RNA sequence: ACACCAUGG
RNA sequence: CGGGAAACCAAAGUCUUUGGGUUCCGGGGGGAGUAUGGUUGCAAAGCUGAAACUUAAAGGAAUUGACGGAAGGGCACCACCAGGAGUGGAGCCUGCGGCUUAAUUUGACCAACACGGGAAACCUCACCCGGCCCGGACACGGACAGGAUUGACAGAUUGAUAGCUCUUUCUCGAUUCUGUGGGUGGUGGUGCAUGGCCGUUCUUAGUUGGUGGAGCGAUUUGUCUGGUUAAUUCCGAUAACGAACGAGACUCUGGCAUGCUAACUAGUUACGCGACCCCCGAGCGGUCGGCGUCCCCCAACUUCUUAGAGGGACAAGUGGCGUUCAGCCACCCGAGAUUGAGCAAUAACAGGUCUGUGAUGCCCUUAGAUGUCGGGGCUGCACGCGCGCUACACUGACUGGCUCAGCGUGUGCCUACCCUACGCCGGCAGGCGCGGGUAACCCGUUGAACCCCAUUCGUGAUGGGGAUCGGGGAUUGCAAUUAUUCCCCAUGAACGAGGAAUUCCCAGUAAGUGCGGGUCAUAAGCUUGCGUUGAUUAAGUCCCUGCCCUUUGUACACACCGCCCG
RNA sequence: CCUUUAACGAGGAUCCAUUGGAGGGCAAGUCUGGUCGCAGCAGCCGCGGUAAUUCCAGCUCCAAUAGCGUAUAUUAAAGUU
RNA sequence: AGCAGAGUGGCGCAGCGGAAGCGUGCUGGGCCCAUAACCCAGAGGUCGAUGGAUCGAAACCAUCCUCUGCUACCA
């Protein structure tokens, strides 16, 4: 969306992107819906929904939208949360589908 | 600008085959030389260096590009 | 002697 | 007077030099005038009135900006008005998105998109797919003169005649090779780490300090009520005085000199001429004349050409309007009474550029390279957008005839190529042969196009238009297929003046028209300059879009693309 | 136990001083490695998003010192009763 | 089963014989720094089916089919 934001780090955007795969104590979600306060439902694509929050990092410079892949990391003593380390484009997301990473049930 | 991939074959390059230095004569006598290998009858060449015993071939390594007689 | 004119990575 | 944070106040004064008497009442911002108890009222409601919890500020006065669907005064065809040509619609060219792909390298989103001189066949070249090479200084250590190390013929192998590798074994000679450190290169990353350059705010009139004055201070005056100007240009007014930058002045350019300087690398005139030609005139045809880029002059000159020095315009003269000041309007005289550009301030932008650089910090890679050769791409096509070229015909197309320019460039050092006359040959593109020019000397008196004068067409997608496609011929080059460019016969699409929108422009200007330079072995629908024909409409305004200055308001300051309530 | 006393009892490597901090308030480093808005720090303002003076450590330095830090009650600062 | 109404652009509809549009939705442009609002253009039709009259119809007539409202509600 335009503005007169010149100012900023003005353009991060190629045709070139490169995969990255889960690790220890990091899943796969799925945003269920839309919540306010920076938070959001999510949904690990194996089992619990685990509410997540967006991380400093992301605020304001990559944008989730609802029902789209992302790569949260899981917390070791609670369950229930978890903080939104990446997401995937749709390419990605399918491309992933293809390495059969992520258990079909939630499309692109 | 990207990284480089594991290859499949490669390999630099020969290691000089390492065959003895010179034995090129032998004598019939003390001062009573033989030649094994005829020398080159070449202008450039000094009339010192030697052929390649190559049978089917006969090779001067001076004139890399020709002067081969070929029995 | 006065039409409409909301919002902001 | 004095007080106060100040706005302001003869009281809000007589206050750290603190005490005339007395009642009510406040203690950071919320929760909250809420819950609960009491009391009053018919009801609505009034009076009294907490806490848990939460938070680093909420708030007051004034200053400087920015903003205002606030007011006053001005201003700009990147604004409008009156118009012109249009663009948006059509075909094609070219750039950007998307899609596709081994790859379709990439920067940039008024101030990107015919921009990176970016018109890419190789190269360029950064992308993709293969293959050689070291051009890895230097230090140390290791091996090494029956010897480190180099290069290569033949068959296999390979796009390849890369000894690349393999079989075989000659040749070179301390230059290498191995290992450890360390360098080196990079169109690799970051323009949000930088220099420099450029663009833009911002084409307008804006900016700054020294001493003095006001305020506790940020700050303010100087830098202005008013008139004037294109202008913070001047006149003036004056708690300011004297200054600096920008504007102006300045430089190049266009318009004028029958005055000066002086010219076969420029000309004129004259006749010396001489010659051709025609009577075209009196005449005979001769003499006199008429045409000449036909030939000469140690003829005379500088009008035309060249280029130097000076001159010339100053609102100077005259009439109005001006506090009779600064200045404005009109007119005579005149080559002209308002040519066009270059240069340009303080402060700033996370504008663009690491892909201009032997400018550059840090990070990455560095021999299985991100430092070279062969092949492909940058051009691929359902679609969206930008700058443009050609048209939609009779104010025209076609075929002949006629007659006029100006700004330029031209033989290259590495780098190998320049501009062409004239003869011949060919329908044409083009070929062969001989000359001139390092240039006011030759192409060249630059026979340019539109325009001018006559033919054929006749309102019919037609003889308008020239897309798309078939077949053939040339040239450049190492190589033309995905047609490089050019020529010839043929095929003959959309398009009958363009929706909502929107761009540029005031006089030799808009528009029509051709010609040079740049890139260029080949080549402009691009851009940068030059001439040629040459209008309609204005002499205004602040409506729309913005800009400048003053007053005013503000809960904004990341500055209205702000803040902020349920 | 102290005091008085014999006999042994020190070379600094042990007969080995700690607790807090080094942006400001507030005395003391823009030294070097690691992490990269994470881990953490931070009474308050504030540090960390690949060149951290504040995090984790090494070195150096500052404060009080046989003591120093932290939580809470309370007094002065408070002319904020 | 019956009455009444209707059958037209993806959807709601207008269209008293000289014959296809409106409102909404859809896709692309415009306007704006940008998004909504607003402006423009484009795409999409067996006018329910079958015959007949008429010089000619989507329209008039006849038969059938399909929706909707209301009673009938019916071995
Ligand atoms: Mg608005
Ligand atoms: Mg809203
Ligand atoms: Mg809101
Ligand atoms: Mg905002
Ligand atoms: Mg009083
Ligand atoms: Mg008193
Ligand atoms: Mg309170
Ligand atoms: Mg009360
Ligand atoms: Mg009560
Ligand atoms: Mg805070
Ligand atoms: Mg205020
Ligand atoms: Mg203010
Ligand atoms: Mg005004
Ligand atoms: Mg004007
Ligand atoms: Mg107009
Ligand atoms: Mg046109
Ligand atoms: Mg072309
Ligand atoms: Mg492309
Ligand atoms: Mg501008
Ligand atoms: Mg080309
Ligand atoms: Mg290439
Ligand atoms: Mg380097
Ligand atoms: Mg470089
Ligand atoms: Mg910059
Ligand atoms: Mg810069
Ligand atoms: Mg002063
Ligand atoms: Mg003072
Ligand atoms: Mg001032
Ligand atoms: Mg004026
Ligand atoms: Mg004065
Ligand atoms: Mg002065
Ligand atoms: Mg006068
Ligand atoms: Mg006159
Ligand atoms: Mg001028
Ligand atoms: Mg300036
Ligand atoms: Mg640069
Ligand atoms: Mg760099
Ligand atoms: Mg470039
Ligand atoms: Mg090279
Ligand atoms: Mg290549
Ligand atoms: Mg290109
Ligand atoms: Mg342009
Ligand atoms: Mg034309
Ligand atoms: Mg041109
Ligand atoms: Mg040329
Ligand atoms: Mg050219
Ligand atoms: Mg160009
Ligand atoms: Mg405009
Ligand atoms: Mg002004
Ligand atoms: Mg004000
Ligand atoms: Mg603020
Ligand atoms: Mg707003
Ligand atoms: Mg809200
Ligand atoms: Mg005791
Ligand atoms: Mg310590
Ligand atoms: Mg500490
Ligand atoms: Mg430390
Ligand atoms: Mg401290
Ligand atoms: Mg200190
Ligand atoms: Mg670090
Ligand atoms: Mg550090
Ligand atoms: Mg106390």
Redesign the pocket.
Known sequence: ???????????NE??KRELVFKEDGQEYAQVIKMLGNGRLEAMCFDGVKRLCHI???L??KVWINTSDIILVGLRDYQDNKADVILKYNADEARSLKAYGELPEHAKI | ????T??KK?????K?????????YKVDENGKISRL?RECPSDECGAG??????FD?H????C??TY?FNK
């Open positions: 969306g335009g503005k007169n934001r010149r100012r900023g780090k003005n353009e190629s045709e991380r400093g990092k605020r304001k | 600008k990207k990284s480089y594991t290859p490669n390999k630099h390059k020969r000089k085959v390492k065959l003895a230095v010179l034995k090129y290998r260096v030697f052929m390649a015993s190559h071939r090779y001067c390594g001076k890399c590009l081969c």
